[PDB]
Structure 1
Amino acid sequence: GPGGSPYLITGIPKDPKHPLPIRKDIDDWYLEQTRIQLTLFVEALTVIQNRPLNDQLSYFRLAGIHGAPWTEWDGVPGNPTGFAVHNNYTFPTWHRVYVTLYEQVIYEAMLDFIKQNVPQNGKADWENEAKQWRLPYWDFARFARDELRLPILVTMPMVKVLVPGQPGKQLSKPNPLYRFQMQTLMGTLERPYAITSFDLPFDKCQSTTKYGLLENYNADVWADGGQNWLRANLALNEHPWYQNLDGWDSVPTLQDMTFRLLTTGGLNWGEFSSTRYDAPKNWMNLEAIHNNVHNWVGGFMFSRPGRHDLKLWGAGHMSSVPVAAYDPIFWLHHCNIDRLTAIWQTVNSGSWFNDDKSKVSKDDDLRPFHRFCEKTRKVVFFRSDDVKDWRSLNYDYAITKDASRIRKEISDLYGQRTKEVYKDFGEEDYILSIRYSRYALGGKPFQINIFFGDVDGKDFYDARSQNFVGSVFNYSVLSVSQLPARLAVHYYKKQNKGEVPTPRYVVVNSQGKAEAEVKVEVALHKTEGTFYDADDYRRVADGKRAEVDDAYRA
């Protein structure tokens, strides 16, 4: 660490005037200030982003822990892989520590900012705000203040901040949450830090981008492809195709998935914590939802075959495990994944590494994260049990302050629209199970799209594609996910004399082409009763690969 000793991760230190401060919803937090906390977060994160690459607490090196360029960090040596855990049962706990590292570094930068910039009259007030501040979360599953959206702040290129010592003065500055920008293309950073198999030109980017990388544009456009936040919002609101037709109400699949994740009882830790697969009702897991959000924020398709005026594709850092951590929204996404873990823990309190598969991983060192063990007086790595109680890291969430009311809060935040629309149809539920190998395309990402009915051989991509039901993203031993299917099955039955649909799937690569030799096991399952009134699911149809037009075949 800095000054030649391990960097001890503690969370923000405990102050008795500041009992368990909460991580707030970033839109609520911004809206109440649209101002010292906003100023401190902006100015501290700007400093951290501008730190040199040799500084291990620079934004670049902190993001670098996750994936590329796969260097050492804090004395811990660095298919090339990073420190991050994916497709294993420590996925939530490794990321709980990682988010806390980021929050702690930001807090320390806030204190430094105050020491260097704030006059005597205001130091105590500004220090007080730094001590109350916690990293906000992005509630990707909550309607923004009728639709799911990226945070307001992430969509603003500039942000107004206070000028300490100049009352009433504010300055507009580049917003460090909008993008992370380096001084040169990341493929040409000083060794060993160059970002350089990847199937997207991330070596040619200077800044992070959402949907900005498309084939057939000048390579200098890729240096900074922009933040297509409207396109990301569209993706985040994915739902079955039939719901864009007149006379049908829509429900965002991400909100239905999240409501199911939090409300479904009976999962063990191994089922909840990960996509890893060594009863399909239990395949709705945290990591699978997290994987889809990565795709929907960044985009993963660089190209599409054929000629298309409207170009709905485009790729960006958040879809790509090696470089997703560079996008500032990464940390806000993982702050909410940590919040979801804390909520699920609260309503499943005995289910902690409690199954035979996850028990084996409970004691894994969560490298490269150090802490001082007070019992053995040694610097050690974090382990999952150290962070079972997130409050040991001196933060909390409003929703986990009161267990007795958490089930009503879950329903109010995530369940209203699902229940409103589901209530219009009979008392049955349908789900799709999906099982795949994350290595099926040699480690390259891919998207599994499911359809009920005939597939358009030139349009098999998203909610605009005929008969689309939903998607599963391989964000770079098998892997499982689950999709809601209740509403899409109802629509199909109405057009097909009551017949249960055969799920048809297409595996799409980053060129927009269908991969014919990626195995996916898809099935449709039914139970009597609605899921939120809970069941006994039974398989009712087996999946089949769909064919596409010859020009659209990999």
Structure 2
Amino acid sequence: GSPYLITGIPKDPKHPLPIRKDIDDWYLEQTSAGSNRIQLTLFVEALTVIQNRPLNDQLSYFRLAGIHGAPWTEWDGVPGGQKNPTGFAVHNNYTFPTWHRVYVTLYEQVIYEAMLDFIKQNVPQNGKADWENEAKQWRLPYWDFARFARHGDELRLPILVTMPMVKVLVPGQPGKQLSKPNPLYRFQMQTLMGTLERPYAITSQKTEEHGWSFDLPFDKCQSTTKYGLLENYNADVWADGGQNWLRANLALNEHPWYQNLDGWDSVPTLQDMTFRLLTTGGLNWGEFSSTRYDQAPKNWMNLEAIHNNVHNWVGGFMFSRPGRHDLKLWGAGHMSSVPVAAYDPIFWLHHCNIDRLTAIWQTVNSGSWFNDDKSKVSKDDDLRPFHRFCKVVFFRSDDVKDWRSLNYDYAITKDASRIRKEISDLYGQ
């Protein structure tokens, strides 16, 4: 049904600006004895429904991920097949943060709507009000890739992302938990993705490694993978190369930046680079938002550059065998490849945190919004393919300058009096 208006979760007066929580904190709460476990259940059941929707359902997980890149089809009546090929997503431009702000909100809203469906069909009548109230309080959790994980000093993929199965409530049965395949662990189709019905087939994707072109064999995958695609391995391994989360964690903490860091004062960790992003003063929106601005600054990195490295480190960015010292990080996977990154469910949790970093930076740089010579040109670009009710029109970056208009917030931005102390507590050395 289109156009599909993207609004964020509708406003309820007894749910003022609910917050998007850190996914590790949220998971730990939901699985504690003092929680009803309803939000975890709702998220798992809803995302499972969404992933199981057919290709001709534009609110299926496949089609939502397909907005970003391959297989470069139409969405919501907006044509695809743009050229050479590429998707709706903005990369290397100043609208990178705002295009993705709307994309993350779309995902969140679709999940919320599926939660309501689940409740109507599965919850005892006397429990629906309670479950609905949890659905209205739920927002899409973020993965804090720059925060040291709880340990009863290491950055880690989310707890829940590393679990193949997850236990959920059986509505109306205080005892029953049931273990189910975890829809956050990976996404797979019922066949190899390169054999999907036209026009949905996922092709191999070109990459360059040590000055040679390789074909990343995503057409040969049935499941998304982190690090599991290696050259000169049998293609039956590539069908499901695994969620090799230990290697992703290693990459996050070894922080092999792709940038040349000659002349830098130090090689920062991912936490310290993030800290500098949020605390370095005097930068304009174009400098903060995108690689396009750049001779490049040293001892600081822009949001998109950090983002690009984290994608590489989560997905695996070396298909062909590297030299001896790099073998510890060998392997390629979806998140390192723009055309197919959005299929890995961690994509959305990562972009939730990029959205949070943007909100934080906005809060402490309120005068810098598409306001310099460079980013000014792009401010009024249509953020296709996303529709809103003004007449129905395309989103523009100014529409989402205030993320609260989309009826979510972050704890760190809600409590703005403390924001500089909180940035220091979380990410300061």
TM-score by length of 1: 0.70
- CA distance change for structure 1 residues 212 and 163 in 2, over 3 Å: closer, same or farther? same
Please give the root-mean-square deviation of Cα atoms over the aligned residues, in Å: 3.3
- Identify the residue that residue 24 of structure 1 maps to in structure 2: 21
- Retained in 1: the 8 A contact 2:264–2:299? no
Question: Following the alignment from structure 1 to structure 2, what is the Cα–Cα distance between the partners of residues 292 and 75?
Answer: 33
**1:352 CA displacement:** 0.4
Question: Following the alignment from structure 1 to structure 2, what is the Cα–Cα distance between the partners of residues 245 and 272?
Answer: 18
Match of 1:212 among 209, 228, 247: 228
Mark the runs of 5 or more structure 1 residues left unpaired by the alignment. Answer: 416-554
- CA distance change for structure 1 residues 396 and 309 in 2, over 3 Å: closer, same or farther? closer
Question: Following the alignment from structure 1 to structure 2, what is the Cα–Cα distance between the partners of residues 33 and 277?
Answer: 42
**1:54 CA displacement:** 0.3
- Identify the residue that residue 15 of structure 1 maps to in structure 2: 12
Question: Following the alignment from structure 1 to structure 2, what is the Cα–Cα distance between the partners of residues 244 and 321?
Answer: 21
Deviations 1:182-216 (A, max 9, x none): 10001000000001177200000011000000112
- Identify the residue that residue 391 of structure 1 maps to in structure 2: 404
- Identify the residue that residue 537 of structure 1 maps to in structure 2: none
- Retained in 2: the 8 A contact 1:37–1:130? yes
**1:251 CA displacement:** 8.8
Say if 2:293 is the partner of 1:293: no
Question: Following the alignment from structure 1 to structure 2, what is the Cα–Cα distance between the partners of residues 231 and 300?
Answer: 11
Deviations 1:283-318 (A, max 9, x none): 621000000000000011112267899653000000
Alignment coverage as a number of residue pairs: 407
Deviations 1:51-103 (A, max 9, x none): 000000000000000000000000000x1010000000000000000000000
- CA distance change for structure 1 residues 250 and 160 in 2, over 3 Å: closer, same or farther? farther
- Retained in 2: the 8 A contact 1:244–1:250? no
Match of 2:125 among 120, 124, 133: 120
**1:165 CA displacement:** 2.3
- CA distance change for structure 1 residues 140 and 308 in 2, over 3 Å: closer, same or farther? closer
SS in structure 2 of the partner of residue 109 of structure 1? helix
**Pairwise mapping of residues 305-384 of structure 1 onto structure 2 (< 5 A)?**
312-373=329-390, 378-384=391-397
Say if 2:404 is the partner of 1:402: no
SS in structure 1 of the partner of residue 78 of structure 2? coil
Deviations 1:336-375 (A, max 9, x none): 00000000000000000010111110000000000011xx
**1:111 CA displacement:** 0.2
Say if 2:145 is the partner of 1:140: yes
**1:282 CA displacement:** 8.7
- Retained in 1: the 8 A contact 2:40–2:168? yes
- CA distance change for structure 1 residues 252 and 117 in 2, over 3 Å: closer, same or farther? farther
- Retained in 1: the 8 A contact 2:164–2:182? yes
- CA distance change for structure 1 residues 345 and 249 in 2, over 3 Å: closer, same or farther? closer
Question: Following the alignment from structure 2 to structure 1, what is the Cα–Cα distance between the partners of residues 167 and 298?
Answer: 47
**1:235 CA displacement:** 0.1
TM-score by length of 2: 0.90
- CA distance change for structure 1 residues 248 and 333 in 2, over 3 Å: closer, same or farther? closer
- Retained in 1: the 8 A contact 2:277–2:300? no
SS in structure 1 of the partner of residue 388 of structure 2? strand
> Which is greater in Rg?
1
- CA distance change for structure 1 residues 27 and 252 in 2, over 3 Å: closer, same or farther? farther
Deviations 1:21-77 (A, max 9, x none): 000000000001220000000000000001000000000000000000000000000
Greater RCO, CA 8 A, separation 6+: 2
- CA distance change for structure 1 residues 190 and 402 in 2, over 3 Å: closer, same or farther? same
**Pairwise mapping of residues 413-428 of structure 1 onto structure 2 (< 5 A)?**
413-415=426-428
Deviations 1:220-275 (A, max 9, x none): 11011000000000000025899999999999610110000000000000000000
Q: Percent identity?
A: 100
- Retained in 2: the 8 A contact 1:211–1:225? yes
**1:403 CA displacement:** 2.0
Match of 1:42 among 41, 44, 47: 44
- Retained in 1: the 8 A contact 2:265–2:299? no
Q: Greater helix percent: which structure?
A: 2
- Retained in 1: the 8 A contact 2:251–2:329? no
Deviations 1:366-421 (A, max 9, x none): 00000011xxxx11000000000000000000000122210000000000xxxxxx
Say if 2:73 is the partner of 1:71: yes
- CA distance change for structure 1 residues 166 and 225 in 2, over 3 Å: closer, same or farther? same
- CA distance change for structure 1 residues 19 and 316 in 2, over 3 Å: closer, same or farther? same
- CA distance change for structure 1 residues 308 and 134 in 2, over 3 Å: closer, same or farther? closer
- CA distance change for structure 1 residues 113 and 190 in 2, over 3 Å: closer, same or farther? same
SS in structure 1 of the partner of residue 237 of structure 2? helix
- CA distance change for structure 1 residues 192 and 242 in 2, over 3 Å: closer, same or farther? closer
Question: Following the alignment from structure 2 to structure 1, what is the Cα–Cα distance between the partners of residues 64 and 93?
Answer: 22
- Retained in 2: the 8 A contact 1:238–1:252? no
SS in structure 1 of the partner of residue 46 of structure 2? helix
- Retained in 2: the 8 A contact 1:325–1:331? yes
- Retained in 1: the 8 A contact 2:261–2:298? no
Question: Following the alignment from structure 2 to structure 1, what is the Cα–Cα distance between the partners of residues 259 and 140?
Answer: 36
Question: Following the alignment from structure 1 to structure 2, what is the Cα–Cα distance between the partners of residues 232 and 170?
Answer: 30
- Retained in 1: the 8 A contact 2:43–2:111? yes
- CA distance change for structure 1 residues 285 and 57 in 2, over 3 Å: closer, same or farther? same
SS in structure 1 of the partner of residue 239 of structure 2? helix
SS in structure 2 of the partner of residue 172 of structure 1? strand
Question: Following the alignment from structure 2 to structure 1, what is the Cα–Cα distance between the partners of residues 195 and 265?
Answer: 49
Mark the runs of 5 or more structure 2 residues left unpaired by the alignment. Answer: 32-36, 205-213
- Identify the residue that residue 95 of structure 1 maps to in structure 2: 100
Question: Following the alignment from structure 2 to structure 1, what is the Cα–Cα distance between the partners of residues 256 and 234?
Answer: 35
**1:334 CA displacement:** 0.1
SS in structure 2 of the partner of residue 244 of structure 1? coil
- Retained in 1: the 8 A contact 2:322–2:330? no
Question: Following the alignment from structure 1 to structure 2, what is the Cα–Cα distance between the partners of residues 251 and 232?
Answer: 19
Question: Following the alignment from structure 2 to structure 1, what is the Cα–Cα distance between the partners of residues 259 and 303?
Answer: 26
- CA distance change for structure 1 residues 325 and 240 in 2, over 3 Å: closer, same or farther? closer
Match of 1:5 among 2, 6, 15: 2
- Retained in 2: the 8 A contact 1:9–1:371? yes
- CA distance change for structure 1 residues 309 and 358 in 2, over 3 Å: closer, same or farther? closer
SS in structure 2 of the partner of residue 360 of structure 1? helix
- CA distance change for structure 1 residues 243 and 293 in 2, over 3 Å: closer, same or farther? closer
- CA distance change for structure 1 residues 351 and 243 in 2, over 3 Å: closer, same or farther? closer
Question: Following the alignment from structure 2 to structure 1, what is the Cα–Cα distance between the partners of residues 262 and 15?
Answer: 52
**Pairwise mapping of residues 153-232 of structure 1 onto structure 2 (< 5 A)?**
153-196=160-203, 199-232=215-248
- Retained in 2: the 8 A contact 1:267–1:282? no
- Retained in 1: the 8 A contact 2:257–2:309? no
SS in structure 2 of the partner of residue 241 of structure 1? coil
Deviations 1:106-133 (A, max 9, x none): 0000000001100111000000000000
Deviations 1:449-487 (A, max 9, x none): xxxxxxxxxxxxxxxxxxxxxxxxxxxxxxxxxxxxxxx
SS in structure 1 of the partner of residue 215 of structure 2? coil
Question: Following the alignment from structure 1 to structure 2, what is the Cα–Cα distance between the partners of residues 19 and 401?
Answer: 11
